[PDB]
Amino acid sequence: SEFARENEMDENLEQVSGIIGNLRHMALDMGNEIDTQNRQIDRIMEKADSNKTRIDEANQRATKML
Amino acid sequence: XXXXXXXXXXXXXXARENEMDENLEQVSGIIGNLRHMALDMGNEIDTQNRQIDRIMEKADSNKTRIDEANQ
Amino acid sequence: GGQQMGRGSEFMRNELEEMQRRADQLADESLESTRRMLQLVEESKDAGIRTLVMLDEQGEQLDRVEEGMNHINQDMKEAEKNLKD
Amino acid sequence: XXXXXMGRGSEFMRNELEEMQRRADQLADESLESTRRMLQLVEESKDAGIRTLVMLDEQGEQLDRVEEGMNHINQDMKEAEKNLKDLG
Amino acid sequence: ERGKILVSLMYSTQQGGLIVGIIRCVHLAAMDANGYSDPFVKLWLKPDMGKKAKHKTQIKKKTLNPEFNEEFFYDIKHSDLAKKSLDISVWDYDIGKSNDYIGGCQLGISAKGERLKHWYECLKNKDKKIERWHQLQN
Amino acid sequence: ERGKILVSLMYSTQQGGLIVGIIRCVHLAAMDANGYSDPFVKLWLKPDMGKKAKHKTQIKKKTLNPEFNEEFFYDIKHSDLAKKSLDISVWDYDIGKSNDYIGGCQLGISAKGERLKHWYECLKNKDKKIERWHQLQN
Amino acid sequence: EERGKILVSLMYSTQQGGLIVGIIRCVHLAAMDANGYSDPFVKLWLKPDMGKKAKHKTQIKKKTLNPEFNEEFFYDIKHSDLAKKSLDISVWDYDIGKSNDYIGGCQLGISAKGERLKHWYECLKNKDKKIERWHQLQN
Ligand SMILES: [Ca+2]
Ligand SMILES: [Ca+2]
Ligand SMILES: [Ca+2]
Ligand SMILES: [Ca+2]
Ligand SMILES: [Ca+2]
Ligand SMILES: [Ca+2]
């Protein structure tokens, strides 16, 4: 008689197919965040190698007084 | 010594720039590891992204076998 | 004029007892399936949120480096222009 | 007679020379600090990337359980219908 | 002796349950003084059929070939009917006293012979009416 | 007889910290002989450093559905908020003896279910109140 | 240097389904007594808070600045669910007449940084593998 616990099945299946869709969204937006950071690292090394040359082309000195 | 002709001498300091070469070497090395992770982070996502689509097929197949069993 | 019932008495009791069990064992597995699917898909959602945190809290670290790289370019140029005479 | 190759040094007057000796250390100290500051920034981004890999591997191994669970459930639902039609 | 009863069992799918059919009895036991009896069939589903499982037929007068021809319904699934057992009893209705026990029969897994064969062929043959003759006794 | 508690979170950029709001509780567990309880809510942020990060509400008298409607503040940067968790505890204030433990709930990155989703939607939505319910456990 | 280092070995066995924390030996510990030595014992804490069975301690060594424990401990947890957790390793000097003196500590987990974080990383990557590394006590 009390088969109202069957509604739990359709309630779980509704959430299973729903959370799975959220997994699809989380994984896609996660890749967009990394692809943005991956193109940011390539932008950091250009500003990092520029600091290295600005140091080597400045830390070369023989103008000292004895 | 005294008043000879044509000579020189070593100041005679019997620096802190070996760090600059050491740090910049460690800086430029770790930046190479930042690309190493970022590329391997993307390969893992693409693996998991295709894995979700593979789960969605088996998730809908289990749903149909439940509906075709519970009438 | 074939034959009367032979070994049919105990056979029928096996076909009826299993029909009671096999019909309800299928319904019990349908209940365990939805529960097992929840305990796995939900736990994978929690792992995806913890990853979204450490990933988004990493992008702010790369922003501190990029903006930190430009802050060093200022102090390097300010030291070169100041070193003239 | 000597010929060198800024050039000064005869009578005591305005220095204007200690600066070029001090301004060189300022550029040198700010250069060492720059190499130190860049090392701190990239090292922290390295650890931050490691803290993200452990989360991707956590979600990856958890996705394996979801995929293996769908296969275990698929086999269990098949054994449910397989034993219902032969024994009944 | 003690009588024989004709019972028709059928599990209806569109109606959703078993259709028990009490048809006719032949040569029932004499439990009165006039030599005849006032019989009526009382079938009971004993395996924990909770609410109202005791269906009774209308009481026939002084008769020797009682033709009930009444059918009864039991709203139960085909799965849970296998673990069931139908007890069919025949009594003699008395005026101002308790009813005498004429005969009785049992159909189900606990039964055997023609009684188990009848309960088996109905669960195997759905939407089919299976009627057989059973012998009544204590 | 565990109950729920309404919690509202928001990161104020003007104030520069976290605004934890305890609104009310529903169907709290009774911890007094009179069937009711004297409930109040404690707050304790994860102490990554050493300082006083405690907050307590006022003590309602004889009620299982209190109505605090209070708010509390924690001066912590948004960047350093993900590395911490908030411990929400409900206690039954006793006068003589020590207080009893009714329910509890932790919100952080190490949490699970809605206890984690609530803490995440605040790290992604700044200057926006996020009020949701949470079930109290042991 | 300063307060010394500790040799810790981490391993996750899938046959057992839990982390195997190993405290091998310590070197150059801080002397917290008046006799010039110390009585060291390592305490392990792997939980953020309410832990029922998460406090593990080694045996107390007698008057030693370079102890050798050679012990292993087991934490029961789900299949590689130690990301959210962080192992806190502490070294103490046992005092009979007063409170124990704190020598040094160590933190292994996602909250860690540098050599301590990398040791926790390589433990979760390679399963059924024993990874050991030295760590400087405190900062
Ligand atoms: Ca009579
Ligand atoms: Ca009579
Ligand atoms: Ca009380
Ligand atoms: Ca009280
Ligand atoms: Ca001492
Ligand atoms: Ca001592």
Find the count of extended strands of chain E (DSSP E, 2+ residues). 8
Supply the CATH architecture of chain E.
Answer: Sandwich
- Biggest beta-sheet profile of chain A: none
| Total domain count of chain A | 1
Order of helices and strands of chain E: EEEEEEEHE
The residue fraction in helices of chain E comes out at under 10%
Structural class of chain A: mainly alpha
**Rg of chain E to the nearest angstrom?**
15 Å
Shape of chain E: elongated
Oligomer: heteroheptamer
| CATH topology (fold) name of chain A | Single alpha-helices involved in coiled-coils or other helix-helix interfaces
> What is the 3D form of chain A?
rod-shaped
Give the N-terminus to C-terminus distance of chain E in angstroms. 11 Å
**Gross CATH architecture of chain A:** Up-down Bundle
User: For the CA atoms, what is the radius of gyration of chain A?
Assistant: 29 Å
**Count of alpha and pi helical runs of chain E:** 1
PDB class: exocytosis
Keywords: membrane fusion, SNARE complex, PIP2, C2 domain, Exocytosis
Assembly: heptameric
Entry title: Structure of the Ca2+-bound Rabphilin3A C2B- SNAP25 complex (C2 space group)
Short characterization:
With 85 residues, chain C is mainly α.
How would you describe the overall organization of this protein?
- The PDB classes it as exocytosis.
- Keywords: membrane fusion, SNARE complex, PIP2, C2 domain, Exocytosis.
- It forms a heptameric assembly.
- Structure of the Ca2+-bound Rabphilin3A C2B- SNAP25 complex (C2 space group).
- The complex is a heteroheptamer, with two copies of chain A, two copies of chain C and three copies of chain E.
- Chain A has one helix spanning 7-56.
- With 66 residues, chain A is mostly helical.
- Chain A has a single domain, classed as Single alpha-helices involved in coiled-coils or other helix-helix interfaces (Up-down Bundle), CATH 1.20.5.
- Chain C has one domain (1-85).
- Chain C contains one helix and no strands.
- By secondary structure, chain E is mainly beta.
- Chain E is built from one helix and eight strands.
- Chain E has one helix at residues 114-124, and strands at residues 4-12, 17-26, 39-45, 54-56, 67-74, 85-92, 100-108, 130-135.
- The C-D interface holds C 15, 18-19, 22-23, 25-26, 29-30, 32-33, 36-37, 40-41, 43-44, 47-48, 50-51, 53-55, 57-58, 61-62, 64-65, 68-69, 72, 75-76, 79-80, 82-83, 85 and D 16, 19-20, 23-24, 26-27, 30-31, 34, 37-38, 41-42, 44-45, 48-49, 51-52, 54-56, 58-59, 62-63, 65-66, 69-70, 72-73, 76-77, 80-81, 83-84, 87-88.
- The complex binds calcium ion (6 copies).
- One calcium ion binds at residues 33, 38-39, 93-95 of chain G.
